[model samples]
Each structure stands twice: as C-alpha cells, then as structure tokens.
Target: FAFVKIASDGKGFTRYGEPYLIRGANYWQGMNLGADDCSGGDRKRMELEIKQMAEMGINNLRVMASSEGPDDQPYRMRPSMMPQPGKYNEGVFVGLDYLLDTMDRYNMTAVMTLGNFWQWSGGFGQYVAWITGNQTIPYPVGDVTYDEFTQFAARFYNDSEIAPKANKLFKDHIYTVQNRRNTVNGKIYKEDPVIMSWQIANEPQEAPASWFEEISTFIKKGAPKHLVSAGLESKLDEYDFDRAHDHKNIDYTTCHCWVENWGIYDPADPDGLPHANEYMHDFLESRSKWAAQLNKPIVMEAFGMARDAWRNPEDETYKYLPSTPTSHKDEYYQKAFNQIVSLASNRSFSGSNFWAYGGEGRSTYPPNPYGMVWLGDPPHEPHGWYSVYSNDTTVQIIKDYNANLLKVQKELSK
Candidate 1:
C-alpha cells in the first residue's frame, strides 16, 4: 500500500536529468552520544543540519537505522538481551520521523538504511551473536542451558506472541514515516519534491540470497512505493544479483566502497596511498556493467576517507592527536574527497552519501577510523558526547564542500 511509481527511463531509475544528488552526514538514529547517554541528540542536531545542507544546495542524506545490539537485533535495548528479534526497538521511529520531516523540508531525499553494516550483513552468513557467544539466551543468564539456546534459536522467529508484535511494530513505524509529506508542524517536505530510495540493510553480505529476496519484497510490500536497494559492500559475485536485481520490487544496485585495507597507510607509501578514483572507477565500471545487464540504476551509495587517514585530531581513535595540527590533514582529505567526486560525476554513477554526520566523540564507538564527523574523547562531564566533541563545525565544512561539488556536477551534466 505504501508503494508508488516515479516516472523512469526504461534502462534505470533517473531523475530524468534532475539530480537526486545527496551529500550529507550519518548518525545513529536512536543512539546516545556517550557511554551513559541516550540523549536522542542526533535528532536535534540533524534538524538543524538539514537546514544547513539545504542552504548549501545539498539534496540527500544517508541516515543510519537504529543501532544493532550484540544479539543482532535492531537496537541495543539492554546489554543482556543479545540476538533479540530484529524489531527490538521499533519505538526509535519517533526520532526517525523528525529526520525525515527535516529532509522533506529541505527538499532532500534520504538513503535510509535499516541496519548496521558489519553486525547484520557484509559477512559470509556468519551471525555475530552465534560466533561471539556473548548474547544471553532467552532464560535467565546462568540458568539457561545450551539446549535452551538451541530451542530458543529455533523458536525465535516462530514465537507467535513476540514475532508478530515485532513485525508489525517495525512495518507500521516505517510506513508512518514513508507516508508523511509534511510534519506535525505543517512544514512542507517537498519543493521540487524528493524521495530518492529506500535501503533495506546496509552492507548485508552475510545475508543469504534469499534474505535480499525477502527484504526487497518486504520494502515493496510495506513501505511507500519507491526505489528499493540493498546497501551491499562485498564483491558483486558474492551475491545473487540475478535474484535481487530481477525482483520487480527493487530498482537499483547500491554498494559501499572502502578498499585499500580500510584506509590504513599503504606500506608502500605511507604518505601517499591510493585515491578512491582508481578503486571507484573499477567498482563503478563493474557495477555499471551489471546494472546495464539488468537494465537498472546503480548508486555508489556510500564512500569516504577514514578519519585517521585524514588525521582528524579530535578523533581519539585516529593515530594523531587533537592538538597535532590539522592543516596538512585537511588538505589531504580534501584531495581524497575531490578525487572521488570528479570520477563519479564523470561516470554513470547516480550519487553518493558521505559515511556519516555526528557522534564523533561518543565512546563504545564502532571501529570506523574515518567516519564520526564529531570525533573526540568521551566527555568527562557526560552529556551525549560521541565521536567528535561537537559536530557543529564539521557539519558546516561538509555542507560547503558538497554544495560546491553539486554546482560543478550540475554544470558537467549539462
């Protein structure tokens, strides 16, 4: 019921020459900023950031879905309940709507992901909880046996009481946001209009071919009728592209690129490593050929420099220090960013979303060295401080840089 059709070229999804271009940051949808903080500050920050992006001519955001718990469920409600149902924290949609509404106001579409990259997908069918053996079984922690765990695993998706509730909770909430054209404040979410696409899962290589089939179907069946894509990162052969691509429900091929060993200094030249251009060209050419074979659109949905490679001092995870001077680092990062943009715009690429937006300073951080625009140490005072101390300044730089690129990309398109 949520599905709708956009006018399209027979070959693939296109804006009919209008760019569904996106340049924005990412953040955990319903995450806290610090160890003890679930401040829901991501929403408040995004609301303002959206306005800033719009002013700068940016038109897309890649919004991270709820954080996955150790259990492989969507949100980490409690530490003990690992591998809970995928719908464990459906309530987080409350804040997601705020983000959607803001994007709508700015006439910016969003590339919304349903789950994290490493935890849920992008592996080889190995479930994290099963491998780690850290999640608590359904029963009390010490009282539960391995047999109970097996039975629990068998009954997990079959638990009539819990599964259905979980399913409906997720379906309903996602539907609510997809259907909104305006927020409660009566603000308009469309000027020229914006609705880029819907991504079911981020980098889900660990997912089975059938999983893509089912999730692709689920989005068409559940969310507003729009372009549906899976944010896959592994090599294309690793997936059953035939099935995922043939699904009339899915509209494009989407991938994340982070090659050259996750941006560590190439031992050959620690100072000058490979730019994203070479890798992106090959990645895009291969993917473009595949999309041509399938006659569908392809988006380079995710790509960026690691914070450490850029030597972002505020990011403690980076080898560099906050006070270590950043002029050279900033220049190096700008070159990397520029390289990708130049190559992509010249190719058959549709658009891209920079890795992320906020939470640079928060601890218990995910292992990304280049992401987290707000990178910094955990705040001693304790507010919601994730990656960076404050993403406010970083947000400005991102907007300005992307806005300039959009202008040039437009000229090139002509």
Candidate 2:
C-alpha cells in the first residue's frame, strides 16, 4: 500500500531509490457544466487518458476532490451544508474511487487531496464571498472569525452522526488518505484502508495554528499508521507556523510553485519572462534549501502556466487575454516544461505532479495549439503541451528532453 519512500536523510518526501517522475495531468474531482450535469463525460475517456499516461511512462496522478460545477461538492463537505456531514454527497467519491482504482490497475501512484484547496485550498478567507458569490458558504464560512462556528464545525466534521453515514458509504469504495481523524469520546475510529496519507486541509492560509495542531494530533492519534500532509500552497507558511517546513507534525512539505507567472514576471520588464532561469532556479533553490533543512520530503504538487495576458508580451495593455496563437505556442509550452523539469531534477522533491490531466478552462482540444487539455468533452483526443509526443514535432522535442532527463535520473540513482 505504501509505495513512496521517505528520503534517506529521514527528511521529507517519498524517495524512490530512483526518481519517481510523474508526467500526469490534474483531473477535476467535482466540477459541473450545467444544472445536475457533472462535466458530462464518460468513464471510458478517463480510462483512456490514464492509459495514455502509462504509455508515456507517466506514473503518478494528483486528482482534485471537487470542481467548479453545480452539484460538484468540495472535499470534506456535503452538497447541502458547508461543514455539516449529512449534506455529504456520495456520488463525489464514486468517480474518484473509479479513477484511483483504475490508476492502481495501471500501476500508477495516486496522491489523494481531500478538498478543493486550489482557491486558497479550503476557500480563501478574504475572498470567500467573492469566490462563492456570497452564497451560503460552508464550514469556516465568511471571515472565519466566529469562534463558535470553528469549534462547532470542527466537532461536526469529526465524530458526528453524519460522519458515520458518509464513511460507511465511502469506505467500501475509493482510494484515499485520511485528513485527520474523527474521535468519539476520545477514541479514534477509522473505516477505510485505501488511504496512503492524511491531508490536513487544502491551502489553509489564515487558518489558526491551533487548527493545524488539532488536525495533526487527531491524525496521529487516530491514524498513526500513515503519513500526513497539508495541502500547502506556494505561500504555505502563511497559513500556520506549524505548517512551515520545520514543523514536527508535517510529515512531508508540499509547495505549489507557480514561479513563472506568479513570482518572476515583472510588469516593468519589457521582455516577459526575463531572467527566467536565474529567477526560477533561485526561487526553487530557496524552497529546496528550506525543505532540506527541515528534513521533509518536498513535492511541487501543483504548478503550471496558462495562456493568460502575462504570457502575451505583445499586448500593450492587458486587453487581449485568454486567447491562443497558432504559431509559437510550442515555444511557451517548451519553456514551461523545461523549467519544471529542471527544478524537479535539481531539488529535494520526491517528484512533481503536472498541474493536471484534463479540465475545461484550459486547452481541451487534441493538438490544442495551446498547452492544456479539456476533459469536459469525452472521447476527446489528447491535446495541448506536447500534444504530439507520439509524432508531432513539438512532442518529439519534449520526448527527447524527457528521455535525456530520465537517463540522468537513472544515472543519479545508481
């Protein structure tokens, strides 16, 4: 069950004697397109996608637990109530179960994230209303200042009546790692076994240190057999001091590096992506040094670029946004791929999970001129970012690069 290895130095990360290079994409966990329609796709298409990754020697996947769709439930939350357990949706875990089990069949490692930590992971504190349109927000709702709400939701999530029903329904299905445990009368009871690690919370910035300590302790007391990870962001330390690389509860430290657009690009610099290598390497080095010093395995779980205005240097004013080019699109993609690979190869990372496999927001078309693929439409051929690894010129370049990198990895392992 435990396929990842901790680093030899007893620090963080699941170190395979050889590098575990994952070339897979992110899959939406709970997104929908229309009323009652959940990304309207078939199971076969997802299966085919995994098969494609296997063929390409990609061996790991990071799947989100929910998406931006109606009826699309977030992790640890039911469809009805924010933090209440009864409102939990059973369908959400079904598809995930199928996906993970399929990955297992394909000999792929799965990193189970409990909820949508993407929008500040568990919903940002300041932008809660902005993101959710002021709808009846779930647990940790609005501002997260009410001490009563925090304590109430915390107990309701753990050792509540709703927990048993949701657990019973999901226990028989899905491959997951627990995110802390629910203790009843001081006794921790776990129902599932497919879990590999416990995810504390998705990108919990502004969440108090006590929350982390509570969850970390609960995970240890209840599920002592597994490893624990916080769905950390690039600014992970901002969430809680305990989530810092040096915190003892953090079994592994994860950084979602979006250096290209998030950190390095300067509006003043005429040449976009200026000082690309130096800036990127320095940023990664800082993160790597911190992780190494903390003795935790580090994984850049989520990092990628979009064809946003930032990439379009020609636009004088940010007017032209969200469009793709036919000609030099490959140039941008190649740079991103190369940068990510370089960083992973040089750092203390166990491995990196590509931003994702399929989504509607990004490139979804096969041979998509841009570097992204859409999973909302089924039977859709693979596209975006090395769309032609099998035959296209751009893909050939990526293949060659990966091949050479693999050689280095193998050599390093020996």
Candidate 3:
C-alpha cells in the first residue's frame, strides 16, 4: 500500500493486504537533526543513520513534527520549529522534507508526534508561557518538581483564557505541516507515503477526555490521509484512557514503557521491584487486551532501557564517556522483542518502536551544548541513556527479531 491503512477489522496495520507488524525505533529528530542552523544540520550523518536502520530491517520511525523554541528556553531541544507563538523556522522544514524524501526511498514510514507534554521540546509548559505572555514555565529543573510542572502544564487544558489560544496555535501548526509541499519529495505532506500518523502530542499526561477526540477530528477533517493517534502512556492510573481512545477519529493507542524511568525496574538491582521481564509481559498483556476490546490496535511506541547502569544527574561520571557495554540492556531488549513477537503475531497487539537509534552519532561524552549530533538520547538528558547505538549487540537482536516478525506476520492472519 502506498499509504498505510488501519485494518478494517481493527486488529493491526495492513501492508499489501497483510498484517504489518511495525519493526521500528523512535527517531524523534529524524526530521530536523540534519537541519543547518543553531548547531543544527548534518546531512551525511542523518542519511547514514536512516540507511543503517533500513539495512538492519527497521521500517518505521516515530518522529517529532512540532517543537516550541525561543531557543533560550532551559533544558529544551533547541533550534525550535516555532521560536515564538506564531513565528516559524525554515531550516527545520527543509530538513524535515529531506527526511521524508529519504525515508521514502527506503520504504520507511513515521508516526509524527505534533507536540509534547514535557518541557524538553519546550512542550505544553512553553505553550502556557506563550499564551500568558511570559509566565515562567515550570521547568521541573529548579524549584518546580516534575509533578509541579505537570500541574502548570495542565493549565493549558483548564485555564479559561489560555486553552483556546493553545488550541489555535496547535491547530495552525497541524494545518501548515499537513499542507506544506516537501521540496525534496515535491509532494504535499498528507499525500506523501512517509507519514503513518499525526500524534496529538508526545505522552499527553494531562490531556482531557475530549482533547483527543477533538484534535483528532480536526486533523482528519483537514488532512484526511493519515491515522490520528492518541499518544498516551500505558500506566496513567489517574487517566480515563478508555474514553480518550474510544473515538471515531482517534485511530490507535500508544504506550510508552520505561521501567527504569517509571520506577518499576531498578537498574542497580536488576531483579529488584517489578522485574524488567515481568513488566514487559504485564504491560503488553493489558494493553493488547484493551486495544482488542476497543477494536483498535495498540503500539508500545516508546519503550526503552538505559545503558548497563544508572547514574544520578549530579553524578556525571556516566556522562563523561562513550556508551558502555550493553550486557544489561541487551538482556532487556531480547526479552522485549520476544514479548512483542508473541502478542503482535496474534494480531491482538499491533507493533512496538524501541526508544531510539543513536547510530554512530555520539560525538562527545558530555556532548557539546545542544548535543549538535543526533544521538537518539534527547538533548535535555544524559547523552546515551536510552540510545541504541550502531554497533551494539542489541542491533543483532533487532535484526533477528525483525526477520522473525516478517516470517510470522503472514501467519495466523486467517
């Protein structure tokens, strides 16, 4: 299929009339890391990374389609796509067009997340700041805690005065992105084959029940070509994920698994707390059942495991060197792939995109300021925390499983 389609039976995505298990990784900056400003662009590196993934049998990317700027925002991905409320950045778009153009040549596709709830990409907190004319974004780094910042970002949904403004800005961005003609591919974005979905946001922890329905409808009515996804985390106990996902326009469900970050699996004690292997089974079982009941396929879209160990931000030892041996991470990924193979092969679960592909882009230990190179790890955090590097034993695991997915994707479809 030139444009990917959700199976009519609502079991999984279809490619050439068969179930297509997405064997992929999150290349969030796949669109812009190659861009040329603000320590921005690098064509050689980006293309090589894309080609490497292709050569390894990876076929999908979950990428960023939106980011807020004003570049000086603390702890955020810089060279913003939107520097100010209604402003723009052309360099990002050129790189984005190049990205899609390149992906097409390799038969790769993307799930393009439009915004974020965290401040790293100058996410929701930045929008709140934009609407309020410079109210300090609760950046969780200083006085504000992570929980505190969510409360501040939640204001984007509840504040009577700010919600509409934020909606307008996001809607405007969606329209512009969907309609723009890619200079490299020479096709309007919605007509291009590279995009698989328009995600409302990256892990919208504070999204209201109606938000997904409304925003998804807005996107489909305008673009009418791509899937509209509700980017929710799998374990948001406070949220009514059911209501948000059971909508006409919201086509799929996504969960981000981070046992290390989610406080389930302790890196120091590999067998501590919720065992990493156990959590993989536990999370996917519930999600696949949920998706089946809702008649929608689910994707474990952003699961990740760190390098061999853990280090506090204050303890910068891990930050001062190249990515270490993945003996631990390798053990973790092999389990994750096996789990995905079981659920996805049955059509009850659709797909999974591992956290990232760092792919030979690590330039420095404490990578220079804005990280400049696309290291898969976001610029706001330690450089190689969750990155899947080019030469890791994990790549061989990925290759083996990708081959497994292809072999099994054709089975049990009847």
Candidate 4:
C-alpha cells in the first residue's frame, strides 16, 4: 500500500490507514534552486528552505515538475528541463530527485504539478511555438495584448491546429518524470511515496473534456499508487469544472482562489481587506459544495493575496516589499486556513497549499533579472507579489493555523 491513500469512500485521505490532510505550501522553485540555474544555484539553500518549511509544520509542498526551454523566452523558468524539445537536462532531473529525497527525510509529501497553461514555465505557448517554428511565443509583452497572447497559448488544446503535437510533448514529459529513477534516494519515482499526486497542469483552465480523460488515464496506468489531478481555478465555469474533474483516474478536486487577481479585493483601497472574508467564504463554500457532491477529496491547492498597499499608492508601478505590512494577507490566511481546516475536519475536504513559501528568497526593490530571485510569484508576474517570506508576520499566522489543523486531525483520529 502507498503511504497515502484516498479514502475508500473517496471522502478524504488516509496515511497508513490513519486519517490525514495535506498541510502544504507552494515551493515551486525547489528544483530550480537545486538545478544550479539562474533561479538559484544552491542545493544547500534549497534544503535549508525545506527544513524551514518543516519547521513551519508544512507537511506537503506543491512543486513544479516541469520547465520548458529556449531559456531566453521572455518571463520563463530558465535552465528549463527541456531547453529545447526532445532533449533533457540531467541536472534539473537530478534536482527533482534530490528535492523529493530531502522532503522524504522530513516525513513530508508533495503534489507535483506537471505543466502550466501559463508561459512563466514556457508552457502551452512554448509547445505551440516549438511546433510552428515561431521565433517567439506570443506573450503579453510590449504591444501584444493579453487577449492575443491568451488565445494563441490556448491553441495547445485545440484539436485542429497544434493539439496533437502539443499533447504529445506534455504527455512525454509527464510520463518520463513518473517513470524516472531517482539518484538521490535510489528509489524509482513511481514507487516513491513522497509524491502524493501528479497535477495535470497549473491552472489549466478551458481545456477539452476528452483531453483530461486522455491524460488522467495515461498517468493512472503508469503509476496507480499515486493520485492524479487537473489543477483548475475555483472560479472556473461549471462546464469546464465538470469536464476536468469527472474522470475515474482524476482522483481529486482542486481550487485556486486569487482575490486580487479576480478583482474582488483592490490593494489600493485599504477598506477592501474587510470584504475579502466574504469572497473567501463564498468561493470556498461553492467549491466545497461541489466536491462533496462529486464524492471526491478537495484541496484548496493555491490561494494568494499580495502584501498591503504600502509604497506609492498613487503611483501605478508600486511593488509591495517583503518588509511591508501583511496584516491583510495575515487575516486572509487565517480565514482561508480556518475555513479549510474546519471543512476537512467535517468531511470531503482535504487541505491546502498556500500560494507560496518564499523562505530566505527576497526580491530587490529596483528589480533583479527574471528568475534571479525565486518566490511564490513566477517570472511573468511581479517578483514577490504573492510570496510569503520567512520574516513576515504571516509566518506566525501560518504556525497558529497549522497548530489548529493538527488539533483537528488529532481529534479526528479519536
């Protein structure tokens, strides 16, 4: 039996037959840091940060399992595992191996997200661009409107144009990762319990229904002990939600809420913080409601809000510093964690991995080069925009919430 098991009734999770939950954080840069890349070329720093997460009572991490290449792609994870199609970066693969082994040592687990619909990782767009021999993947840069870039990127899922080639590239990488032999711990990847689930993509919204079936089924047969998921946003349309989640091999449900990104909480208005609780409650309730009805364990896998509006409120280009106030974020974390923990204690709901764990990694005010300073935020977005650094007051809030979660899990065991 695997270390972690989906409950027989599919309500939640069990570890060695003991009821369990995923108390986690997004450490997407772990492999990058370990890869000796521009992201951060220090394995020592990676382990120390993992240790820091363990200290924070985070038992799970949501990590990036794939990075596309042509390293100079504007706003992409560099030293990409596939610097160009059909070639592999041995160092990056070994980085993942070391990461899993290190986390296993701490008795932690992970959700390995395979690809991205977004270009921060040279995702769908990269595959499309690679197939078509385009010089650059269309992105929201310079005069290119996001509307054009988005439609271009989403062609990865279109059956007529480049879908076949794009899907093959994604499937090949995903299958290769699962079947890989880990050098760090001398264990086969599929046999390792450190990986709790294999996510189809990071927020793969508006993908085809049949495509989810194809990928999830492929992942399941290759690694039955491990779970599979299609990472989707909480606010996604019901049509897309049902199409993505209603597969036999799709073992769980996922939700990622972004209050600021979704336009509910404006950082410019300080008073908006108070109303965030309402949106959180509504979005979570709706997601939990669906998960319970669908008879699958649910994880609020990603959620984030930037630090309070601090510098140059009137100036449009202001980026919040790590040293700035996180009262709004702290409150949001408490409320979000509070609700999810309660839901998991009750039924069906699993747990969450907050947007990011930016321990020890900090961004410079004037801005460093892309991928220079790793954080919860990706290269395409503002550096440290949603990253929760070690020194922030939110760390204390995380500890408190985790303790509360422990109490609930312990009580459930009784």
Candidate 5:
C-alpha cells in the first residue's frame, strides 16, 4: 500500500484513496524492549503488542524515533539512538527498521517523533548541555522536578548559538532516518507507508514560532511524502495553538492534556473533581473549535489519568498509591474517550492517542528511582503510574471507543 496522505480537504487523512480515522497510542519505547527480555526489545513481545493494538482497532502509533546520550549517564535510559552528534547506533536503527516492517505487516502507521522536550530520552537538555562544553543541566541531574526541568529544556528555544547546532543535529538525524533502508523489507524510509507523520518533539514549550516553522519546513523538504507536526502541548499560556496551526508546513495541529500537569485537576481532591472535569472538557472543545477555524485536523495526541484516586505521598520521591477501587480513573477515562469521540464526529478533531500503552511490561525499580529501568515511560515520569496495561479495564474502554468510531465513520461514508 502507498503512504497515508492528507485528505483532499486537508482536514483528515486518507489511505489507499479512502478516508481514514486515526486510532492510536503512544508506543514510544517499542524499540527498546524485547519479547522475552524486558530490557532490550523483544521481537515477539513487539509482535504481540502490535497484534493486540490492532485487535483493539489501533491503526497508528506515535513512537520516539530519536534519543541522545553519553551512554553512561546515571539518570537516563541507555543505548541511545544517537549517542553523540554525528554518531549513530546501528543496532537501535535496525530495531526501528524491524518495528516499521512489523507495523507494515499489521497495516499500522507511525507518527515518528524525532526529538523530545524532556530528559527521559536524553532530549533537548542533553543537546544543550553537550553543545555548551558539558554544562550541568540546570535541575538536579537525578532528582529534578518536572516543572523545573521543563523550564530548563525550554532554554533551547532561546540560545542563539546552541540552537543552530542543536537543530542541525536534529536535522541530520532526520536525514539519516528519512534515507534509511528498512533492513527487513528493503523499503526506503521516505517511501514506506508505515510512517504517517514526523513530530518535532514531545510537548515543546517556550520555543519561538519560527523555530517550529524552520524545522517543520526542513523535515517536509527532506521527506516530502510525509506530514509534519510540532508536537506542541498547546498549553494555554505557554504555547500559541493558533500560530502553531497557521504554519503552512505543519500539516496538522496537536495538543496534550494532563489533569495534574496543568494544575486544574487533582485525583486526591474530591472537591476539585467537578471543576477539573469541566475544565478538561472545555479545553478539548476550545481546541477542536480552533482547529475547525484553521481548517486543519487536530489530534489530542497525549492524555491520561492515574489509577483511580492515585497519588504519591508528600514526602516520597515517587511512589504511587492506587485507590483500592479504580472507579475514579475508569470514570475519567470514559469521559475523556467519550468527549474525543463526540468531538471527532462533529468537529475538526481527527484523533486521540492516549498517553501510553504499557502492555505487559513491569517496572523493576522500587516505586521511583534515580536510575529506574526504562519500561517505556521516560525517566522523569513515575513508572507504572499512567500506563494502560493489557488486563486493565481501560483497554476494553479503548476498544469500545474505536468500535464506535468505526461505526461513525461507516455512517459518514454512507
């Protein structure tokens, strides 16, 4: 099959000349884990995961196709895709090739993210530190707070000297992937149907609009067949969704929602529940309307809730205490999924990719550690907190949502 294309109206996607609805999940570390062994990726496990996702009607996956590191770093995942500038890891690249080949077999498409805003994958902060003669990352290396770390990473947008070097490294990595030949099927990356779009980073903030335009344009020029997105979080104060969607090179718009991240919701606070849910629904509605005005498809690319009324203890570094009954989480998921479905049916919203699919993998570290085993969630996030495991009721919810979406699509087609 040929690659998925932006539909003629430029508001949705098409595959094989038919309109396609994207049902996706974040499988960012599918290349890192193995079937039998949880550390290095297992082909068998990858196969099983993809098959399960497909059965649930997941047709797309957003994956982290890039990572940077000095390899021996204490607080980050190892075996980096690009250990240093101008250096590439053949093994990791091959794993990605195998992943793409396997996805093709399942008729799945990928939204390949080329960089990250956080340190979990040795992202922008690593690049900034590397180019600045090994300057220390502003936050505590192993025990940094999320808000602080994001502020540090956002510095990438302002450093005139470091920005070019960093963007060049990113572009070079893109070129490498764009030209890579799939070892399994001998398909060139650009020509393959497995990739649906190229994402700039995961939730970048404080970056100038021109930075997005430049990099997105660069990627489009290099891989003309693919779509490009900024992967902006669309935070009300931190990002400009209207300006982001206005870029000609950005084929679509993207947003992410986190109840706790935005300070609007707290699972532990029952009094805040109503306000939180109301705010979330309004956020989705506002973004959908904005996308409609732009005449572009927008996706809620990342969103999730912790288990029930889950929370870490105040003094604890990272320890999740799940509520005995996960009714809260279940309710949140149902509401979010229902909202997404309802919007897609009548608005310019095109898709939703939940925060993650952490099927069958378990974290070996105690709660949260300085050097935790990477089980898909990046180093910064509490492991096992937001993952949607295979046995969780959440899977069935997702499955039902997809089935309903299919029904809607069929009716629309008719």
Candidate 6:
C-alpha cells in the first residue's frame, strides 16, 4: 500500500521505509491479452498467474507500457498500442490500466517500459523509418544479424531530425500515461503505488549516457513521484555502464545477461559449460561492483537460456524436446539464480527478472509471412525460447531464490 522509493542511502529501494527486494519477470505482453480470452489475455487466467506469482513471493513485473505502429503493418509485429504518431488506441490503453489495477490488487508493482530498442514493439528503428519516409530497416525481416540491428536502432539516438520526433513520441506517451487517471480506480497514475519505476526502453544500446540522462531527467521532472531507469544490458564495452548510472535522475542501475548472445556459451558445444558459468559469474560480480560504485541497487533484469537440446536442424525452425533428460538449461538457470541469491545476501545485488514469462499461453495466430509464429518472441527472437512456463521446474528454482531473499531481507532489517 506504500509507495516504493529509493532508499535514503541510495543503495537500494524502500517501501514505506522498509527494504524491498524485487523478484520479477518480464510480463511485457500482459497488456496485449484480451480481457476475457484465456490463452494470453483472459482476465481470470492473468489473475491466476498473479496469484501464483504472489504465492511464490514474486512482487515485481517488468511490463511494456508502450508499443507503436499500425494494427495491420505487414512483416511487423501486430497490436501496436499506438497506431500512428499522436493517435492512441483506447483498447490498448485501457488494457494497461486494467493490468496496473490488477497488479495493485495483488501487491505487485511494475517497471513500466515506455519504448523499446527492438522491432517487436515497433521500436526506435520503426519510428526512424517512419520519419524518414519509410526508409527500410537494415536488418533482414526474418533473419536478423545483431550488429546490423544494433547499428540501425542506435541511429535513433543520433539523428538530428528523427531523434526529436522519437523523443516527442516518447514524451507524449509519458505524459499520457503519467497524467491519465486509471480507468478502473480513477486514481491518477503518478499517484499510484502500482508503478515502481519507468524504464526508458528495453535493453537500449549504443546511445550516449547523456541521452539516458536527458530522458530520465525529463521523466523525473514530469513525474517526480516515480523512479527512472535506462534499462541497459550492461554488456562489456558496448555501453558506458558507469556513466549511464551516474546521473542524478537515474534511480537505480540494471543489466541483462545472454550467454549465447555474448558468445560465451554455445548450446551446441557440449564442452562449453564451464566457460559459460565462468563468464556468467564474472559478469555478475563486475556489475555488482559497479553498482556499488554508483551507490545504487542493480537488477539483472533479463537473462535466459534455450531448452535442452534446442537446435535448428535442416528445417531452420527451432525445435526442442520438453522431455529431454540431459538439460544444461536447468543448470544454467540454477547458476544464475544462485548468483543473484548470493549477491543479494550481501546487499550488492537487488534482484533479477528472467527474460520472460510465457505461462500456458499458446499462440493461435499464424506465422507472420516471414515463417515465424506470432507468439510473443518479439521481432528478433524465436517463439517458446527463454520463456518460463507455469509447469517448468525452473519456476521452483525461482521460488526458492525468492524465499531465500525474503530471509535475507528479514535479517538485513534487523
């Protein structure tokens, strides 16, 4: 019932002056579900999921608060919250209002992401292409190269013309959400405790730290009651981690881990487990130290691994056996969860939210003309990958970590 705020020491967060540990999941597509449809949207099913999460002590959700593009854009993700520049969809906006209202009922808070750096949400590059008269996005539609996408998306930060338009879009959405009264409760969003913070974007890259400062400062000035974060991945050398978190308006720090994406782990390489674990351990430690230097809490907001024996065979569609007996995926999750639990014991680490939650939601939509399922893998990722399902043993690991952190919090308070 109390608002969450940065601690007096600026090292962690407090709720009504009590220490709060964030055990979260990326429930970004939660707003897209239908109010009565059960597969991904049903209000009853979502309430069940929230109840289960609350029972496990999971109290935070990182959800998408903004999405762009038209409803019928071909070769792109569907259900854009914002159909066009300055136009809004009451349906999608109301879904967000409902989600926040539901989260409040369950004692859960959200890290509301305003925009994205990826195409799944019609992100920065889409806005750029729109402003530039439909300039083609450089990365291939179905198959994208990371470097190409990063280079293309990062242009949103530097373009003299596109940047302003993009920033205006972001500002417009921020004001719209922050000032609008919740349809369910009539309480203005800025005064609601359901929101923990407002993230600039999901895993933004290549932008200067000052750009983060500018956006974060703007958010803080506009909505002084809420916290702000840049939502960076904190990959080595790719970003100025220190400089990004150094700003006064930035409340806390964040990082994401991807063993395969960073080339430290190969699912195909049977002998790479040790190297993968080593890289993950070192990465968390270094980030923890950096967070300490900034005197702020840090969260491992996104990290995930594919299912055991996951592979793309001759068909090129990713396939995996759910019953595979030999799974390094479970071990990888345990290691990551263990590291977070260990770090939280010492207060250097605040928490972690795995890459996603795909509990029992199966896609009924067909593959986008690009031969990919319309499931919630974002634009670049394959479906069913990195999702934590309701029946997964991985959920047990997460619950155990959550339980341990509650123990840690109780002891720390004393």
In order, the Cα lDDT scores of the candidates are 0.46, 0.44, 0.78, 0.83, 0.75, 0.75
Question: In model 6, what are the clashing residue pairs, if there are any?
Answer: 37-42
How far is 360's C-alpha from truth in model 2 (Å)?
Answer: 8.9
Q: Encode model 5's per-residue lDDT on 208-327: one tens digit a residue.
A: 888888888998898898888889888774238865667888988888988876777776654556766787788888887777777888888888776654343342323243223345
For candidate 6, lDDT tens digit of each residue in 165-221?
778877888888778788888888888889999888887776777788889988888
Q: Point out the worst 10-residue segment of candidate 1 by lDDT.
A: 377-386
Q: How far is candidate 1 from the true structure (C-alpha RMSD, Å)?
A: 8.3
Best by lDDT: 4
Clashing pairs in 5: 33-41, 33-42, 34-40, 34-41, 34-42, 35-42
lDDT of 4 by residue, 234-292 (tens): 57756667788999999889989888887888877767787788989888888888887
Please identify which of the two predictions, 1 or 6, would achieve the higher TM-score against the true structure.
6
TM-score of every prediction relative to native: 0.63, 0.62, 0.94, 0.95, 0.91, 0.91
Q: What is the lDDT for 174 in model 1?
A: 47
Write one digit per residue (lDDT tens) for candidate 1, span 1-414.
Answer: 222233255332335454434454444332222211142244555565555546645566666544434433321222211123333333333445566656656766666665433322211111233333545434313675544543443321244554344444344434544454443345332221344667766554344455567667777675534677777663655245554565677777766665544563332233544554455556666766676676665655655433332444344444323333323334433554565456446544455555444333443444222123233221111122212223333444555668666765576557
Worst 10 residues of 2 by lDDT: 180-189
- Candidate 2 residues 1-414, lDDT tens each? 344545566543343454445444444332211112242334665666667666656655665443222223332222211222123333443455566556667776655554432322233221232232443434434565445443333331343453344333222111223431222122121332233455655554444445456556655565566566777664544224334434556577777655444555443333554454455455556666667666666666665443334445566333112244312324544554566556556645454554544432333334222112334211112234212222223434344445644654564466
Off by over 4 Å in 1: 1-7, 10-19, 30-39, 67-91, 120-195, 234-244, 260-269, 275-277, 308-347, 359-401, 408-414
Model 5, residue 38: what's the lDDT?
A: 31
> What range of 10 consecutive residues in model 3 has the weakest lDDT sum?
311-320
Best by TM-score: 4
Q: What local lDDT does model 2 show for residue 289?
A: 67
Greater lDDT among 1 and 6 belongs to 6
TM-score comparison, 4 vs 5, better candidate? 4
RMSD of each: 8.3, 9.1, 2.4, 1.9, 3.1, 3.0
